[PDB]
UniProtKB/Swiss-Prot annotation, chains A, B:
The lineage of its organism: Eukaryota, Fungi, Dikarya, Ascomycota, Saccharomycotina. Residues 20-310 form the ABC transmembrane type-1 domain. Changing E507A: Loss of function; slight decrease in ATP-binding. Present with 3250 molecules/cell in log phase SD medium. This is Iron-sulfur clusters transporter ATM1, mitochondrial. Residues 345-581 form the ABC transporter domain. The chain crosses the membrane at residues 20-41, 65-88, 138-161, 163-183, 250-268, 284-305. Belongs to the ABC transporter superfamily. ABCB family. Heavy Metal importer (TC 3.A.1.210) subfamily. Residues 42-64, 162, 269-283 are mitochondrial intermembrane. Performs an essential function in the generation of cytoplasmic iron-sulfur proteins by mediating the ATP-dependent export of Fe/S cluster precursors synthesized by NFS1 and other mitochondrial proteins. Hydrolyzes ATP. Binds glutathione and may function by transporting a glutathione-conjugated iron-sulfur compound. Disruption phenotype: Impairs cytosolic iron-sulfur (Fe-S) cluster assembly and decreases cytosolic tRNA thiolation. GO terms for cellular component: mitochondrial inner membrane; mitochondrion.
Length: 585, 585
């Protein structure tokens, strides 16, 4: 309820502040007319109360002008209220777009660890419920809480000024009792809403976790156990929502009992004032009409807005998504990369763990030199994608430096660092789009001749010549509508279309046959000139990197050896010699 | 608006029908009291209108009983309305649970092609918006549309009976004008709501597609292009929502102008009836009070329920998810599998394409015999996971048979078929849970000694002995918090814990080193007895299946050859000989 006010009453941009003030003026004029209309009703009743002695005479125009003033006052109240709702809905819709676009870019700016420590369907559900919560809070605050509070203020002022201080005592007493009762029963009521919110979040989490892994559910026949794990949280949500609605019905019944006792005591005191002759029947109909037209929107406010604290909770968690902490960022004076330099990465005394408990790269130190196709081998789980994500600066180590041409990568701009490093990862997800949009995702501003020659360069041409909708077939959710071989060839096509300088191939071939991997490695080695690209092959198939220029052996950090292939085979008892021997036998 | 009525007024289960009838009776009694209360106001006004000649006398109890009847009638109306809302909220919450649980199981019952041709975040968003739409439609239909229609009916009846037929003419004319104006401006208004719904769905789709592939966005620096593709649909949604709210403000202003003209003409005709002496001032305050307490909830109905056709659209698309067509199902008299038989699969004249355009298995015919570790090789894209999904009966072919022990698999129960077939797939997703819950997902009713010996059997023991929270480390979203090697060893641990009979290994080793794959294949070959499990290895690493019992060569369907390894190497120019030669060179 603070950053929303910062968005609807910002610093600068005086046009939206003028629109907010126009909405406030229309609100004030609408409530003034809605208080003026029972005075016209009192006038047309207390004027008609005289004794008429002629059934054939028309009514005088002095009463017709008061009846027309009643009608014009009622319609003017409704018209001004709806114009206020129109202009503040324009302001609210602009605030909703700017908060959605300002939270999406900051959701994109965060590091990889925060995204892997969350759930993307949960993020999308939180963003959607926060947007609908912002809409519901602004709609409730421009229609229900603010106008009825202003109406209570002006009706209490009218009843203080017009009919002495006993009505002031009655109105102050019933506002005091109303506030005490509402505060006590809301402090009782919030626990069931907390339980309902927790049960609904657990239900959505189990439904999403069972719908993403549909193949891993139907492989092991766990439909019934997942349905029961869903059903338990559904029963908890049903019990908590039933108790929420029953306690809110008790809230509304007690509140409107207090207000009905107030209205009946006000009409009774007005009647015994009429007995004394100080008042008239116009005061009776004025007092009832004022308190009744105050009592009806209080009932509808308490009824139809049963979820407003939940909307504040959703708005607050959307702003908490907005107000998180990005921890990977460029320095104060960021340097820029040179123009024609093959880059040689150098790790000195690096040490990094994804959590502070374990340390993956226990004092690793090596160098990837420029222009040489180097190759990283190692046992499964020895941190090779770790040093990939450390060059790419997704994370940052605890000690050591990640130097490029002597300068650190902490002092480089992160976009100018990530624009020269092309990479295929181990597990490749795709977009729910065609093959053409997925290949063209490398360079957006790329001509289609380059896209065609890259697709025919990445050994994907017979697949497009065999498909009936080539460069148009939708690959479905996450690339699951094609196999693993076409997915890895598509990722290699993306990196070949980007045409970067470093080219980290992180398991470039895992699900391709021997002929396709040999033709693909031949047409990648035949692509670029000597000493231009600093190609880094993270590979387990040791035959594919037998012709490499420098091989680096990893075993849970602490690089054991590095050198050419013949020297590593002619070494007395290395790890690469044993891996090559079990490969050849 | 039909299946919702089928859920709130079902066949059988008479307790919820008694609860619905109790809600309807409380609604009728609440509206009867709300029509009775201005008659008590007319009584206490027309009784107080006499000439009082004493300021010191107390008011008579004959007026105090009418004032107490006014207060009791108002509070009884509010109390009966809130009790009705309570019991129908109980019915609505039970209907919401049973529709969520009845749509989740049918979302699980569908085939794989429907799930791959959709988006899981879209399914979760549709389920959540359909649930909130069911809640909003039932809350609106028990509080706004039905009670105000019943109130309009009884107030029109009162004004027909009590004050002649001229008020009947006025009320019928203003209902006719109200209906004509509402129908015409709603037929104008629905287009902007359609555009807003399309823009919101496209915005949510682009946000989810960019948040799932966060690594593939940050690899290629496409933050700004995705932000602009988000921003365009956000601007379309903002324009359409602004036009929706402005047209709804025009709707409410015109409707309440018609009703204000009706109320002013009714008060004018009542006044000129009072001039004739037939009526009194009690009729004036009765007519205004009745039409005013009808006019206020019509205004709040038109205002606060600005999204009800959207709630019907979300409810009908949730029911459309419920009323889809499952096309993979067991027969009328499903057989069951025998008790101790090693199963031998036999494909005869099979032909299957995922779409009717292309045909993957162009007349394939082979046999996987029982007790033999067979091995499928082939070029990348030749349909190996296709015949995996055809044995598992995710899909069904166009011709040919998929026989097991002579009998077809169309006449077997699908759960008794899927309970003997264990399988690891190519791309393995995991649950957002620990390693213990992910290994235990194979057999839920498995003792923990079996889980420990399977984890130490699937070569995962040094990872658990190196982790600081072994069997407790959360693997994050979709298993991305561990590497590919631990993911494939986890899937092999799942299949080893299920202890099935067939064991389709679909690229069991793609991201493991040579030592780990050799130890894993040795401890899998040392597990089961001879001639018990009909192990089927879909493999590209031809060294891992050199000791297989029967190798089958695929190339875009139409199985080329099948036989042992030595006979396939000693063949004049086969495909497997060329793959083995490029493997050895
Ligand atoms: C969130 C809180 C924001 C601030 C809260 C507001 C606090 C002020 C609350 C009440 C002030 C009203 C004081 C009542 C005295 C009005 C005198 C009065 O009775 O005038 C009424 C119309 O009243 C009327 O039309 C109503 C008067 C409306 C003017 C006050 C509205 C505030 C303007 C800013 C006409 O009846 P009469 O007695 O015959 O007129 C006497 C001469 N005008
Ligand atoms: C979705 C549509 C569902 C059906 C639509 C309803 C259709 C029926 C609509 C109107 C019927 C009302 C007919 C009005 C005649 C009532 C006579 C009357 O004026 O009684 C009022 C109270 O009325 C009252 O208290 C109001 C009478 C309420 C009784 C009718 C409610 C329906 C019961 C079922 C008391 O005033 P009096 O004239 O002094 O009483 C005369 C003797 N009782
Ligand atoms: N976000 C993460 N949080 C915790 N551990 C992680 C995370 N990412 C990777 N790891 C762990 O860190 C260890 C090695 O990291 P990793 O760099 O992924 O090895 P790897 O080279 O990819 N293994 P492989 O794919 O078989 O070659 C393993 O225990 C991983 O599970
Ligand atoms: N739902 C699908 N819709 C359309 N095509 C599909 C679908 N699933 C798989 N395919 C295509 O069908 C062809 C081969 O299917 P597939 O069985 O996945 O081959 P594969 O053996 O897995 N290839 P590989 O992983 O390299 O061994 C390929 O063109 C796939 O893209
Ligand atoms: Mg790795
Ligand atoms: Mg395959």
């Amino acid at each position: 309820l603070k950053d929303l006010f910062r968005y609807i009453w910002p610093k600068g941009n005086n046009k939206v502040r003028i629109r907010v003030l126009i909405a406030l003026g229309l609100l004030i004029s609408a409530k003034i007319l809605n208080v003026q209309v029972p005075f016209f009703f009192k006038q047309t009743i207390d004027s008609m109360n005289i004794a008429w002695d002629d059934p054939t005479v028309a009514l005088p125009a002095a009463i017709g002008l008061t009846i027309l003033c009643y009608g014009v006052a009622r319609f003017g109240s409704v018209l001004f209220g709806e114009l206020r709702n129109a202009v503040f809905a324009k302001v609210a819709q602009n605030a909703i777009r700017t908060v959605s676009l300002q939270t999406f870019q900051h959701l994109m700016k965060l590091d990889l660890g925060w995204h892997l420590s969350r759930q993307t369907g949960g993020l999308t559900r939180a963003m959607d419920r926060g947007t609908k919560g912002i809409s519901q809070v602004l709609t409730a605050m421009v229609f229900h809480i603010i106008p009825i509070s202003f109406e209570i203020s002006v009706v209490c002022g009218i009843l203080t000024y017009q009919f002495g201080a006993s009505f002031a005592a009655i109105t102050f007493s019933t506002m005091l009792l109303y506030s005490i009762f509402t505060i006590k029963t809301t402090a009782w009521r919030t626990h069931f809403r907390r339980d309902a919110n927790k049960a609904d979040n657990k239900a959505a989490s189990v439904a999403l976790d069972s719908l993403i892994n549909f193949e891993a559910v139907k492989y092991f026949n766990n439909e019934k156990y997942l349905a029961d794990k869903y059903n338990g949280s559904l029963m908890n949500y049903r019990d908590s929502q039933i108790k929420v609605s029953q306690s809110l019905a008790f809230l509304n019944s007690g509140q409107n009992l207090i207000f009905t006792t107030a209205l009946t005591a006000m009409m009774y005191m007005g009647c015994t004032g009429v007995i004394g002759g100080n008042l008239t029947v116009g005061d009776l109909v004025l007092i009832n009409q004022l308190v009744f037209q105050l009592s009806v929107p209080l009932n509808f406010l308490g009824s139809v807005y049963r979820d407003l604290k939940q909307s504040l909770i959703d708005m607050e968690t959307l702003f908490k998504l907005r107000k998180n902490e990005v921890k990977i960022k460029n320095a104060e004076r960021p340097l820029m990369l040179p123009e024609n330099v093959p880059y040689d990465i150098t790790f000195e005394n690096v040490t990094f763990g994804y959590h502070p408990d374990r340390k993956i790269l226990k004092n690793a130190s090596f160098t990837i030199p420029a222009g040489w196709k180097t190759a990283i081998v190692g046992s499964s789980g020895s941190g090779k994608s770790t040093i990939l994500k450390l060059v790419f600066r997704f994370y940052d180590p605890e000690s050591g430096r990640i130097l490029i041409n002597g300068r650190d990568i902490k002092e480089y701009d992160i976009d100018a660092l990530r624009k020269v490093i092309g990479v295929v990862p181990q597990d490749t997800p795709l977009f729910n789009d065609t093959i053409w949009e997925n290949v063209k995702f490398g360079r957006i501003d790329a001509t289609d001749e380059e896209v065609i020659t890259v697709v025919e360069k990445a050994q994907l041409a017979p697949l497009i010549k065999k498909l009936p909708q080539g460069f148009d077939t939708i690959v479905g959710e996450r690339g699951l509508m094609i196999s693993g071989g076409e997915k890895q060839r598509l990722a290699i096509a993306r990196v070949l279309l980007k045409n970067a300088r470093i080219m980290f191939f992180d398991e470039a071939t895992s699900a391709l046959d021997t002929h396709t991997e040999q033709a693909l490695l031949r047409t990648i080695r035949d692509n670029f000139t000597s000493g231009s690209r600093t190609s880094v092959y993270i590979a387990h198939r040791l035959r594919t990197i037998a012709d490499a220029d420098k091989i680096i052996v990893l075993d849970n950090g602490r690089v054991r050896e590095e050198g050419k292939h013949l020297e590593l085979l002619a070494m007395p008892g290395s790890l690469y010699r044993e891996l090559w021997t079990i490969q050849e036998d």
